Design a protein around this ligand. Structure first.
Ligand code: FES
Ligand SMILES: [K+]
Ligand SMILES: [K+]
Ligand SMILES: [Mg+2]
Ligand SMILES: [Mg+2]
Ligand SMILES: [Mg+2]
Ligand SMILES: [Mg+2]
Ligand SMILES: [Zn+2]
Lengths: 162, 45, 176, 97, 38, 222, 154, 84
RNA sequence: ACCAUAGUAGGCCUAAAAGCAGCCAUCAAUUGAGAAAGCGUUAAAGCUCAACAAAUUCACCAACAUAAUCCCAAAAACUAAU
């Protein structure tokens, strides 16, 4: 990993990049012939938003997500990983990946409401004032359709809209 | 084949070996051959 | 402050259009151009078009450089026709030999457009041929006086038919 | 290159570029040099001199800039990318102007 | 703004952006190009 | 540096005289003084007439069924004429002039008395029938631009299609029907009279194979 | 499908066919690297159209020509050739200077007239030089002068 | 009011002298030299219609020169539906 | 992203038609760039898009307002289901 250092020394600015040692991939994957990293370790259709140990290897230190070009994930899996990271952050997990702002932490606000499997964002959903009867029912979404292909040990389909 | 490594002037210390062996070959000749070598060079150049 | 592309007759800078409104818009009087350009060339007949480059400076001063005339005037004069063909391709306006195109090449080879690039002699002649493609004048390998004369009579008859047709066409539009 | 033109390079006194073209980590320096030496950037002040120093065994691709205020911006670009170098150069112009 | 059904770019400077759960056409040069999906 | 792909060459296409669309009369020259029943079987089901290209290479394919009257003809004619190049484009009608009368009784009167007076004339159009066929020496991309506008304003849903595109969607309607992994299909159940389903289905559903319901055609049903 | 084809290893790579344009550049690069004694590389810089044309005219006065070749057909060619050591100079934007009967005294002078036109390096008579080598080569006398002084020293 | 100067109409002089070449008042008509003295390359150019796509050769820059021109024509036609 | 130079105000046309009312032709310099794809000008000038080079994740298409006494089972994405 590379980091940028900017130093001010008597009206003179020096900017330089330093290389930090980077952890490497594990030696033996179960499926050496795979293309994308997800299917190389037989992780296809076997991860969810709870799997922090997996979603913490495809995100930036400040909560952002790395581009698909660097990681090498396929387009189908990259969107699923992107969706899980968004759901993971809203769920309260990954507390060390937030930006540091000393001035904003002191003015506390209303206590955080615990949530999980939030498809949308908290500030972009409007109350369902007129729900409706059973023949035309406005169903609150839970989870994402991108995760409907995950393995179901019970065998019953996941209820995405409820 | 390949070309040379393009040495720089920061640490210029390695002269071509073809020149060095020419120096040894020239120095390995008698004065009579010096005149013959000189006359041929003068006639050609 | 900019560059002005103007075609002016040799030593015939008039105090009006198209020189007046264009050159005077940048803030340069015409009387200045009535002395600079007219005295710039005095051995060139008036009435011959001359594409000139005018560089207007921020202090309202100007610089003038004169180039070779346009290809259109050279080929029309070489073919002896007063104007180009109205319908290029359908009709041939004038007939010229390869000498006229080749001889024009040397005259335009010293133009600032071509001489700066140091283009070969084959480069200029092809451009003149290409310009002749849209000008209506066909390049001929070689012809004589009688072959050229026959074309003149045929062109005159077709021109005369069009000249009288235009007069009738104008009359129809006005009356109707 | 287009970014520098819009930000007014007139407040820049002198820019020099020192790099070894035969090295492997000088591609970023080359891209920075071509962006700052573009025609659009040039046509902003007719006194600034752009110097392209070329060496072989220097092994230190560096860029040095002097602003009108009098600050010395020197960034040794060997691991930095072209975008980072331009962004840092562009940022200082607004502050020191 | 202009509440419309389908969003189209009237000039090449219009850029799409999704805010508050809806797609907005925001334009910098011409403010009259601002459009809002309903 | 990129690859210089060859460009299509169109030199064997001849532009016929009067390439613009022919005017269509509002009413047929000989009016029909006898009012006939409003057949609805002329819309239901697939089309059997004018399903293949004759001269041109582009056409508007009618996915659904509907009625075209003189108003729609004017919209099709005016839009194409002012948007195409007469030197490189020629268009041909694929539907006849309006001939079927439509009856409208007087405003606000009690039911009964009989059929009213003839109001206007319409042209029945089934599903899969080309409407306007265009050809020329130009590529499909530019022709598609101003044909979707005409197809959008038609009553029935329609698309702008060409020779290659039409075959591709017909060669995909067969592959999707051959590789289907569902053991039961509408064709198998209806014909064999399984579950006594003939009491619910219509006799025309034997031929429609379940792809047609009323005037609506759903191409995704196998 | 049991396994998605994306996760499966890719099919055998189709053999790409070189077109005429690519093969035309292959022989022109071979030609310009064969009959020309001086090959000087440069970093192409976006200059004014009038200034760029002026540079062409000035180099024409000393019989010096300049050509531009894309890296798509030049890097593979130089890799298999004997000038593989010039690959680091052909990574980014580049410009090639071609001359017969090499003489860099009138070439460096034009280059030094524009302070933002770097001279990376090049090969002169199958000998790779840096900018400093070019400067030393410029101040060096010609063959007649050097050989004329050679007999004096001997 | 601005018109080109009167041109020669004699076929004999036009076939032997190019009047339009001499634009100087003090200059004179340049006499035609024998065609043998003329360089041979001026009798080799395509006098007639321009070369088509097939008359050229794939192993020649002329084919790619014309194919490049055709690509621009194809791109221009497809751009007729610009809304910007 | 980057980047724009030749014949040349092409002929004709018009009060003026300079790639950009229309007609006609659509050749040609340069490794590279259309007698022009769009904007603009009274006409010019000018901006932009194709072509140089540089460079290379992917990018066809899929957006649609509201009713009157008070919303309307409560709630739930995995412990094994022909
Ligand atoms: S390529 Fe197999 S899961 Fe990504
Ligand atoms: K519709
Ligand atoms: K015009
Ligand atoms: Mg060309
Ligand atoms: Mg471009
Ligand atoms: Mg409303
Ligand atoms: Mg209740
Ligand atoms: Zn806009």
């Amino acid at each position: 990993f590379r980091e940028v250092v900017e130093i001010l020394d008597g009206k003179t600015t020096i900017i330089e990049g330093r290389i930090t040692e980077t952890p490497q991939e594990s030696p033996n994957p179960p499926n050496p012939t795979g293309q994308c990293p997800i299917c190389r370790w037989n992780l296809k259709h076997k991860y969810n938003y709870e799997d922090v140990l997996l979603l913490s290897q495809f995100i930036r230190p400040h909560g952002g997500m790395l581009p698909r070009r660097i990681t090498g994930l396929c387009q189908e899996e990259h969107l699923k990983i992107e969706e899980c990271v968004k759901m993971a952050h809203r769920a309260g997990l990954l507390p060390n990946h937030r930006p540091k702002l000393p001035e904003g932490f002191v003015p506390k606000s209303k206590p955080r409401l615990n949530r999980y499997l939030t498809r949308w964002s908290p500030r972009s959903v409007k109350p369902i004032y007129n729900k409706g009867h059973r023949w035309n029912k406005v169903r609150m979404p839970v989870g994402s359709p991108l995760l409907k292909d995950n393995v179901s040990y019970s065998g019953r389909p996941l209820l995405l809209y409820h | 084949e390949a070309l040379a490594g393009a040495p720089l002037d920061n640490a210029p210390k390695e002269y071509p070996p073809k020149i060095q062996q020419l120096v040894q070959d020239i120095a390995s000749l008698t004065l009579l051959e010096i005149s013959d070598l000189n006359e041929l060079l003068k006639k050609t150049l | 402050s900019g560059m002005i592309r103007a075609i002016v007759r040799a030593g015939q800078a008039r105090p009006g259009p198209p020189l007046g409104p264009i050159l005077g818009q940048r803030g340069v009087s015409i009387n200045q151009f009535c002395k600079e350009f007219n005295e710039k060339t005095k051995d060139i007949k008036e009435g011959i078009p001359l594409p000139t480059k005018i560089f207007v400076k921020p202090d309202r001063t100007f610089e003038i450089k004169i180039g070779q005339p346009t290809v259109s005037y050279f080929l029309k004069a070489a073919a002896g026709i007063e104007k180009g063909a109205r319908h290029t391709g359908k009709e041939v306006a004038g007939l010229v030999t390869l000498k006229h195109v080749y001889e024009i090449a040397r005259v335009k080879a010293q133009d600032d457009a071509f001489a700066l690039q140091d283009v070969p002699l084959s480069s200029v002649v092809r451009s003149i041929i290409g310009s002749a493609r849209s000008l209506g004048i066909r390049v001929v390998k070689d012809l004589s006086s009688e072959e050229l004369a026959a074309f003149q009579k045929e062109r005159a008859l077709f021109l005369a038919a069009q000249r009288e047709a235009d007069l009738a066409a104008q009359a129809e539009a006005a009356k109707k | 290159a287009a970014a520098l033109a819009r930000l007014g390079l007139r407040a820049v006194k002198q820019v020099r570029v020192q790099f070894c073209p035969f090295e492997k980590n000088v591609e970023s320096t080359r891209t920075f040099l071509q962006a700052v030496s573009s025609e659009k950037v040039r046509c902003t002040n007719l006194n600034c001199s752009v110097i392209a120093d070329v060496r072989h065994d220097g092994s230190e691709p560096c860029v040095d800039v002097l602003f009108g205020d009098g600050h010395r911006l020197i960034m040794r670009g060997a691991h930095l990318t072209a975008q980072e170098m331009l962004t840092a150069f562009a940022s200082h112009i607004q502050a020191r102007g | 703004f202009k509440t419309k059904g389908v969003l189209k770019k009237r000039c090449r400077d219009c850029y799409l952006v999704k805010r508050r759960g809806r797609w907005f056409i925001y334009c910098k040069t011409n403010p009259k190009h601002k459009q809002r999906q309903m | 540096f990129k690859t210089l792909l060859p460009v299509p060459t169109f030199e064997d296409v001849a532009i016929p005289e009067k390439p613009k669309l022919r005017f269509v009369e509002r009413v047929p020259l000989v009016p029909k003084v006898r009012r006939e029943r409003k057949n609805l079987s002329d819309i239901r089901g697939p089309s059997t007439e004018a399903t293949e290209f004759t001269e041109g290479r582009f056409a508007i394919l009618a996915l659904g069924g509907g009625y075209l009257h003189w108003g729609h003809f004017e919209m099709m004619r005016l839009t194409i004429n002012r948007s195409m190049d007469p030197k490189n484009m020629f268009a041909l009608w694929r539907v006849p002039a309006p001939f079927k009368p439509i009856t409208r009784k007087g405003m606000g009167q009690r039911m009964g008395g009989g059929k009213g007076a003839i109001d206007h004339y319409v042209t029945p159009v089934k599903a899969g029938r080309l409407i306007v066929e265009m050809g020329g020496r130009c590529e499909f991309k530019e022709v598609q631009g101003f044909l979707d506008l005409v197809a959008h304003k038609l009553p029935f849903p329609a698309k702008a299609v060409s020779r290659e595109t039409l075959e591709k969607m017909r060669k995909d309607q067969e592959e999707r029907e051959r590789n289907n992994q569902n053991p039961w299909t509408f064709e198998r159940i209806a014909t064999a009279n399984m579950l006594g389903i003939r009491k619910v289905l219509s006799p025309y559903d034997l031929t429609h194979k379940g792809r047609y319901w009323g005037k609506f055609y759903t191409p995704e049903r196998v | 499908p049991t396994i998605n084809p994306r996760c499966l290893p890719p099919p055998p790579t189709p053999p790409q066919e070189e077109t005429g344009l690519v093969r035309l550049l292959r022989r022109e690069i071979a030609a310009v690297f064969r009959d020309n004694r001086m090959i000087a590389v440069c970093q192409h810089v976006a200059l004014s159209a009038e200034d760029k044309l002026l540079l062409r005219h000035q180099l024409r006065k000393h019989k010096i020509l300049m050509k531009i070749f894309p890296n798509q057909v030049l890097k593979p060619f130089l890799e298999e050739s004997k000038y593989q050591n010039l690959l680091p100079l052909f990574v980014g934007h580049n410009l090639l200077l071609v001359s017969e009967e090499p003489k860099v005294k009138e070439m460096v002078r034009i280059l030094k007239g524009i302070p933002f036109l770097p001279l990376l390096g090049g090969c002169i008579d199958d000998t790779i030089l840096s900018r400093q080598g070019f400067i030393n080569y410029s101040k060096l006398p010609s063959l007649a002068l050097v050989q004329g002084e050679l007999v004096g020293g001997l | 009011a601005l018109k080109d100067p009167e041109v020669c109409t004699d076929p004999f002089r036009l076939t032997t002298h190019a009047m339009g070449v001499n634009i100087y008042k003090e200059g004179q008509d340049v006499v035609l030299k024998p065609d043998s003295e003329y360089p041979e390359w001026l009798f080799e150019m395509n006098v007639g219609p321009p070369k088509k796509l097939e008359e050229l050769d794939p192993e020649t820059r002329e084919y790619w020169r014309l194919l490049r021109k055709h690509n621009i024509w194809r791109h221009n036609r497809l751009s007729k539906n610009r809304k910007f």
